[PDB]
Amino acid sequence: ATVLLEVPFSARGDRIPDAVAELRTREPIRKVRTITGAEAWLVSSYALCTQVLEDRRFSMKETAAAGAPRLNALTVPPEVVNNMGNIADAGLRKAVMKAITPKAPGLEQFLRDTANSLLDNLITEGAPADLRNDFADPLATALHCKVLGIPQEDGPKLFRSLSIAFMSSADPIPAAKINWDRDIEYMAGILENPNITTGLMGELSRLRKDPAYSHVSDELFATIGVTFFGAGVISTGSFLTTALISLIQRPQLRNLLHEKPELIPAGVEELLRINLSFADGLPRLATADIQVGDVLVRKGELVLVLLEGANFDPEHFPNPGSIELDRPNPTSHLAFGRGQHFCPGSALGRRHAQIGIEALLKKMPGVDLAVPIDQLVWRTRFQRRIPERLPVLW
Ligand code: HEM
Ligand SMILES: Cc1ccc2cc(N)ccc2n1
Ligand SMILES: Cc1ccc2cc(N)ccc2n1
């Protein structure tokens, strides 16, 4: 006897397992067991993934209900899974969205200046350099301090919560509550701090004292700061790190982007499409009985939308494992989701990766891995796939 197929399949972010294409062809929705022991429906074709993400009867918020089959344990309060919903209900969606666009005056120059300073410090120190810990993550942390309006020197301590906050664990994590409560107290202090007048926290601090928002809770305001810092920093640092691996492993493309930097936006869109940074399918709970392909998903069951299942589907992206800069459907991948919950940080995430890549290719045009690829250590039981260190020379 064999056991029910377990997810996730591999924590490696540098290769897609051959199993995914076999599942997609044979059984694009099928039962799997998650790390909690729950059953779920794993959805792996582009057609069926888009169906589930575009049907709100597959609910994000209901994944937090007591008693439901779980992908992993909550690392935040259950009402917090619903954070964007709550932002919208408080009338704060347009203001949050405006504050996190990469369009603010000087923001792109700040990203460039910060990427160049981090790269000059690595060049001074000499090879090997670690492009995750000493490049992509500090660039993500400095960008999000600037976008929030909070001091750059507060970025490292907020960042240190993330290796626990974004765990994908079978059981509750006592350190995640200690760090969440601390980080909420920090963001509540920021809303009372008269020096914080710019970015997303300066805007929320003003709206807090405006009569049109006098009954929005102080818990929501602090929560938006902790959730957007952590989600933005983990998502952009982890995607930049694993896109740098895919670029370094393609020297022909690396040289083409170095020679024609105007192609970096189209290269970043293909690196988003092939990115394996999400370690688990996106979870949803059925709120009704709904036909998905050959399966009737029933009310209360867990569905997992496998982003690389959709993004490597050759029926939608022919020659899916190849980076092609002239596809006719280049932004139609699911790297930022789809539907009601499509990432509000999409533009910021694209600009962070374009600027970090442009700066790296100008400063270190000979960048290459300093260890054999199989020597990267892939973090396990985490919501992202990331190498613990990314050693390069140039
Ligand atoms: C390359 C970088 C990023 C990637 C690949 C990314 C990916 C995603 C994906 C796949 C979703 C959908 C989750 C779902 O439907 O279950 C999402 C949602 C979200 N993202 Fe991003 N993200 C990125 C950057 C950011 C940034 C920069 C921020 C904020 C500063 C951010 C904040 C959020 C929030 C708050 C949600 C939940 C939206 C809702 O529930 O309606 N993300 N992200
Ligand atoms: C439930 C949830 C909430 C916020 C999220 C933010 C992201 N960048 C990615 C996935 C997210 N998922
Ligand atoms: C045997 C079985 C299996 C899964 C079911 C899910 C439901 N929502 C209702 C009845 C069910 N019955």
Side-chain angles (χ1 to χ4, degrees), residues 1-14 16-21 23-25 27-93 95-97 99-102 104-124 126-145 147-156 158-159 161-181 183-258 261-314 316-350 352-361 363-394:
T2 55
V3 297
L4 171 62
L5 181 64
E6 292 158 283
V7 290
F9 301 142
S10 183
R12 284 180 71 155
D14 59 333
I16 197 178
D18 289 346
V20 174
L23 219 48
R24 186 191 305 111
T25 289
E27 258 193 308
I29 173 168
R30 62 96 67 227
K31 277 181 220 175
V32 298
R33 189 178 309 290
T34 73
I35 55 166
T36 71
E39 297 186 19
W41 297 105
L42 183 70
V43 185
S44 58
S45 68
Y46 185 96
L48 299 186
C49 286
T50 297
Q51 183 190 341
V52 169
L53 295 176
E54 288 190 333
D55 180 348
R56 290 195 64 189
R57 296 176 296 168
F58 296 107
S59 170
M60 168 187 286
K61 159 188 177 160
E62 296 298 332
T63 63
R70 298 200 68 70
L71 167 69
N72 54 209
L74 290 169
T75 67
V76 295
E79 70 274 18
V80 177
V81 167
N82 203 22
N83 194 56
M84 276 287 282
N86 293 328
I87 287 167
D89 292 347
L92 296 170
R93 181 183 200 236
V96 164
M97 275 314 259
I100 65 172
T101 67
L107 188 62
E108 297 202 5
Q109 194 52 232
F110 171 78
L111 257 176
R112 188 167 38 251
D113 293 342
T114 297
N116 287 325
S117 169
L118 288 167
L119 290 162
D120 285 342
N121 292 351
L122 294 174
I123 287 168
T124 293
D130 176 350
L131 295 185
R132 182 176 85 77
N133 296 294
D134 299 317
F135 182 63
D137 283 350
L139 183 66
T141 293
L143 170 59
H144 286 78
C145 295
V147 162
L148 262 69
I150 63 172
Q152 291 292 132
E153 70 174 359
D154 294 348
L158 291 160
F159 178 80
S161 291
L162 300 181
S163 68
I164 290 171
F166 287 88
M167 280 177 173
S168 189
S169 178
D171 292 297
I173 307 172
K177 173 171 165 67
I178 290 171
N179 286 335
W180 176 267
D181 292 342
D183 290 351
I184 287 286
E185 290 307 305
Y186 172 84
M187 292 294 175
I190 284 291
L191 290 163
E192 291 276 297
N193 184 331
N195 308 336
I196 306 299
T197 61
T198 62
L200 176 62
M201 303 308 297
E203 187 59 30
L204 290 178
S205 290
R206 287 185 295 276
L207 292 174
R208 179 171 171 260
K209 297 304 187 190
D210 181 285
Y213 301 90
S214 61
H215 290 298
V216 178
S217 79
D218 287 353
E219 184 38 55
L220 181 62
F221 287 118
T223 296
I224 293 168
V226 179
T227 62
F228 275 63
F229 181 92
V233 172
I234 202 68
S235 302
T236 54
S238 307
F239 167 65
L240 182 56
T241 298
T242 48
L244 292 171
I245 295 165
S246 291
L247 181 61
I248 284 167
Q249 292 298 272
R250 291 173 172 73
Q252 198 180 147
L253 178 69
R254 173 206 68 177
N255 290 337
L256 173 59
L257 305 180
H258 176 245
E262 67 279 6
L263 300 181
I264 286 169
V268 166
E269 209 66 33
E270 278 289 270
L271 291 160
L272 284 166
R273 183 181 62 85
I274 59 160
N275 101 79
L276 299 176
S277 71
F278 279 64
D280 301 304
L282 304 180
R284 292 296 189 266
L285 210 78
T287 68
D289 297 347
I290 301 163
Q291 193 70 36
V292 183
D294 290 339
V295 167
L296 183 69
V297 178
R298 278 170 291 190
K299 181 182 178 167
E301 293 183 332
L302 177 66
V303 181
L304 297 176
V305 179
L306 189 77
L307 293 183
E308 65 267 43
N311 286 341
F312 287 75
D313 186 338
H316 188 82
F317 288 120
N319 202 357
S322 175
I323 291 180
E324 297 182 351
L325 306 180
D326 60 349
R327 290 181 182 277
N329 61 177
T331 64
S332 72
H333 60 76
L334 303 194
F336 290 123
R338 168 70 68 81
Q340 178 70 187
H341 301 281
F342 180 80
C343 185
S346 67
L348 191 66
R350 281 183 170 106
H352 170 264
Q354 291 168 188
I355 292 170
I357 290 161
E358 177 171 21
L360 181 67
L361 290 180
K363 295 271 171 183
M364 291 182 170
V367 68
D368 189 17
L369 290 180
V371 302
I373 200 163
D374 282 359
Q375 293 304 117
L376 295 181
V377 177
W378 290 94
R379 186 170 292 186
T380 51
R381 303 188 184 77
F382 198 68
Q383 295 169 217
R384 293 297 183 279
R385 300 184 184 121
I386 42 171
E388 293 284 349
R389 289 159 298 282
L390 174 50
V392 304
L393 49 69
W394 53 88

